[PDB]
Design a protein around this ligand. Sequence first.
Ligand SMILES: [Cu+2]
Ligand SMILES: [Cu+2]
Ligand SMILES: [Cu+2]
Ligand SMILES: [Cu+2]
Lengths: 128, 128, 128, 128
Amino acid sequence: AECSVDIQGNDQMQFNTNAITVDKSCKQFTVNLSHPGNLPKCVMGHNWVLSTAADMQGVVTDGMASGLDKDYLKPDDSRVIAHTKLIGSGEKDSVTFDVSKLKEGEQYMFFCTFPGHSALMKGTLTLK
Amino acid sequence: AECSVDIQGNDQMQFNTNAITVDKSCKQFTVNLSHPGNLPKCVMGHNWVLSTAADMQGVVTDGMASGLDKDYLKPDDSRVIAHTKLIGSGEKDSVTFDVSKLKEGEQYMFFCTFPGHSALMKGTLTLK
Amino acid sequence: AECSVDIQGNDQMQFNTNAITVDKSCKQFTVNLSHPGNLPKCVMGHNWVLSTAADMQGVVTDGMASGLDKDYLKPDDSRVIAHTKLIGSGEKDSVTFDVSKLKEGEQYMFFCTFPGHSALMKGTLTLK
Amino acid sequence: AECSVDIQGNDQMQFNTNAITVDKSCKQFTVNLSHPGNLPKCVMGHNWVLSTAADMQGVVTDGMASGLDKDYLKPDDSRVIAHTKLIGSGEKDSVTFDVSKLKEGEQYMFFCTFPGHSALMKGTLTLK
Ligand SMILES: [Cu+2]
Ligand SMILES: [Cu+2]
Ligand SMILES: [Cu+2]
Ligand SMILES: [Cu+2]
């Protein structure tokens, strides 16, 4: 729609898209994450995390150490522009953030920080 | 069978077993690893690494640093009692080691050193 | 010891005992549950739930419906005399209850409410 | 624009142009590489490497041996005038170099050092 996107994470460890475009006219953007799979949060938990291409590796590495309890995210990680919680099969979650936090020109990557998933579950977010 | 076990690592990031039992009457034990998945060594490559429960973390951390070229294994890591190579979809590999290297009473863990997989891909190997 | 018992739930879906005896002289009894397995709460979680033999089936069925979030227990289930929480690999939990709640002569059963586990995970708790 | 060019490498293993013209009036030149594909750095990763036509074969052959960890480029290869990183699907990267390094009259070749890609991924860079 406008200023919002519907994204899914399945048991095949994939997002149903790898490119999100945020319209500059939007004050804020909304990401709706859903898990149409069957596997529970331990095995196939997904979340949606946004940050600069430069910070991904960092977030992913620290998230893994945080553990399942912390939704595989370092508490109050400054590198994380926005994020949903870790959801499992059948669950759902959404997050809205201020388009202002994004700065035209830079590279933005979204991905799941569940151990091993960033390998396949990642994509670019562009501010056009 | 006797003195050998068949183990699999799939695209869902899991081993098809988490407990292996090595009979003391065996002079050597063989582990046959196979990858019935579809994803390439890249994203979902697996391996089977054996070590003491105490050394797991150490091995996992250093392997990650060694990189995909090194099969996510520190070259000549003394803590590794035995290991297969990193295999991808459709591939296969095996490794035989001398049961003597195992000392009854201690704790042994087997796991995959591919970045993130240890979270779920790991089990206990016991000498009975 | 006296007025306390140490019980375990492993990955093989089994308790390390199927009979518990509560001495009448005890004012209260304590159960210490521990999970020596490797599998996470999703797949191989366990809890220790006590009730009359007659209510077990009822508790198990409703517990299943309550879902993982509720520790596979119907909230405020009156048929439940005592219970630990659902624990996964490496975790631990304990519960102490008043021996008074038990009434000599009746039949008591303890079991795990995680889906499918009550088939093997259950035992009798006697007041001698 | 002026003193910069936008180039692409897709999943079909091709550059969106095989000729780049650098204006001598430029002090330095900028190449912006983007990967509009879907395949990961792993299978369809690309990079932009500049060198004399005479050196290409050498760079490609050694870059291949360096491995994926090295971005398929021998470390500190003197034959490489300039280069971007090895990028995957959705990623992006740029490299700026001093036009001075180029010497009018000689032949310059750009290409991707990913195993096999040089067959189709290469072009000429002229200093006019
Ligand atoms: Cu995920
Ligand atoms: Cu693996
Ligand atoms: Cu259980
Ligand atoms: Cu290429």
